[PDB]
Design a protein around this ligand. Structure first.
Ligand SMILES: Nc1ncnc2c1ncn2[C@@H]1O[C@H](COP(=O)(O)OP(=O)(O)OC[C@H]2O[C@H](O)[C@H](O)[C@@H]2O)[C@@H](O)[C@H]1O
Length: 439
């Protein structure tokens, strides 16, 4: 059972940090330049030596601010997040692996979350014995590759926006509860077990969207396409589906502090109470922070909490047989164990799960997710991410197989690779051909 150390755990270093934090917070010490801020960060990191690449990306963000916000940043924001850190009472955070069919729940007030993200912003979250850090130090550091520095800068913009919002929390918002759950879902079911269980299951409703994203569907169980280490590359270079979600919803960062151990095959993570603080455009290299406006939709994203399911798909290489009984049952288990959580959210918002960085074939991952949402007795919204061809194929498959037997469907899918259709047809195209023939 691991306890992630907070700054007070190191009693000696804390004595040093606390005084600096107090000086800044009280105005006793006032930052007159970004260079004075670097000196502060160095003290807080217990560093005696630095170069001018150590804070390069933070400086780049600072230098994009106008004169007035630059002054605000040095004279108000930094002092104010120092004061947030000074409100922390805990000395460590428990990282517990739940027993079979049990849950480890870690609950926080919305303001407490902002204390920890402030710690990340000031680079003071580290386990020195393990030589592990859970803060923004790498994001601040200059990389050789320009595109990587831009990614890191845009992350900083999102986190900065979130912290400015947190500093303005009303009493009511500050006290709201955010919940992280690591859920052990019990015994995995093997392929033949699945084949048998599905005999009683009919395929349920699917809605397709080609132009909206998962986070555009409030009041659903929204899927995070997770790494088995929750958060993936958020504290480094990563900027695909999971990392972008953490960027626009930085409260999710606290999951890093309580779920150190990789998710097992029969575990899933649930996050509740999560709000969205930034908007964005682009993806990966083209990702850019966008300040949220005051449209009804944007206000709702900022003000209405959502519940997120984090499930890690298999990370495939190009020669892996994704249609193996072993690999299909793995994904059926993972998706079903996740989808069946929070049974009051009768609709799943998902998409190309495991089919980007993890190299999954979406035809198959759609089928697996459909079987899983169907067995959970839930509806599914599938985001195709501007893939018109796939949208049309899935629509036709849905129309042909809706309400049909899920076990029969599963077996049909599993026969694809060795069928006479494999060379000239994709899985979806195969299903369409077969389904039409049945007619
Ligand atoms: N907000 C979104 N909403 C709906 N669909 C989306 C969204 N963002 C991306 N997609 C689509 O989903 C696909 C899969 O996204 P990935 O992030 O590549 O998911 P995955 O293949 O499961 O890779 C998981 C890995 O990447 C992350 O670093 C994560 O931490 C893990 O290590 C993308 O290629 C894209 O088509």
């Amino acid at each position: 059972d691991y306890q992630f150390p907070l700054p007070q755990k190191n009693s000696e270093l804390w004595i040093i940090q606390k005084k600096t934090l107090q000086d800044l917070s009280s105005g006793k010490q006032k930052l007159d330049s970004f260079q004075s801020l670097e000196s502060i960060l160095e003290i807080l990191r217990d560093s005696k030596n630095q170069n001018d690449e150590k804070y390069f990306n933070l400086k780049a963000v600072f230098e994009q601010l106008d004169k007035e916000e630059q002054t605000y940043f040095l004279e108000q924001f930094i002092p104010k997040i120092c004061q947030l850190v000074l409100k922390i009472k805990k000395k460590q955070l428990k990282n517990q692996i739940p027993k079979e069919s049990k849950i480890y729940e870690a609950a926080f007030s919305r303001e407490e979350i902002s204390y920890y993200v402030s710690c990340m912003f000031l680079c003071i979250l580290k386990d020195q014995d393990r030589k592990i850090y859970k803060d923004f130090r790498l994001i601040y550091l200059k990389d050789l590759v320009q595109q990587i520095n831009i990614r890191r800068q845009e992350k900083i913009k999102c986190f900065y926006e979130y912290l400015k919002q947190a500093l303005d929390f009303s009493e009511k918002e500050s006290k709201e509860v955010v919940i992280f759950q690591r859920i052990n879902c019990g015994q995995l079911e093997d392929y033949e077990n699945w084949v048998d269980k599905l005999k009683a299951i009919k395929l349920k409703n699917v809605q397709l969207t080609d132009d909206k994203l998962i986070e555009d569907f409030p009041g659903t169980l929204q899927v995070d396409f997770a790494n088995c280490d929750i958060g993936g590359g958020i504290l480094g270079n990563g900027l695909v589906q999971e990392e972008i979600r953490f960027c626009v919803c930085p409260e999710m960062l606290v999951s890093l502090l309580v779920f150190d151990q990789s998710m097992e095959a029969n575990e899933v993570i649930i996050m509740k109470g999560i709000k969205q603080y930034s908007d964005y455009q682009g993806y990966s290299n083209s990702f850019r922070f966008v300040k949220m406006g005051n449209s009804k939709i944007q206000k709702q994203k900022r003000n209405n909490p959502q519940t997120i399911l984090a499930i890690d798909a298999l990370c495939f290489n190009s020669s892996d047989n994704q249609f193996s009984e072993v690999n299909v049952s793995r994904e059926l288990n993972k998706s079903y164990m996740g989808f069946k959580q929070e049974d009051q959210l009768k609709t799943i918002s998902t998409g190309k799960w495991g089919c980007g960085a993890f190299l999954g074939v979406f035809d198959l991952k759609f089928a697996i997710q459909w079987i899983a949402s169907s067995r959970s007795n839930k509806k599914m919204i599938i985001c195709t991410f501007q893939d018109e061809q796939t949208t049309k194929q899935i629509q036709q498959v849905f129309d042909l197989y809706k309400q049909k037997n899920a076990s029969i469907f599963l077996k049909l899918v599993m026969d694809y690779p060795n069928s006479k259709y494999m060379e000239d047809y994709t899985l979806l195209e195969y299903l369409i051909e077969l389904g039409k023939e049945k007619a």
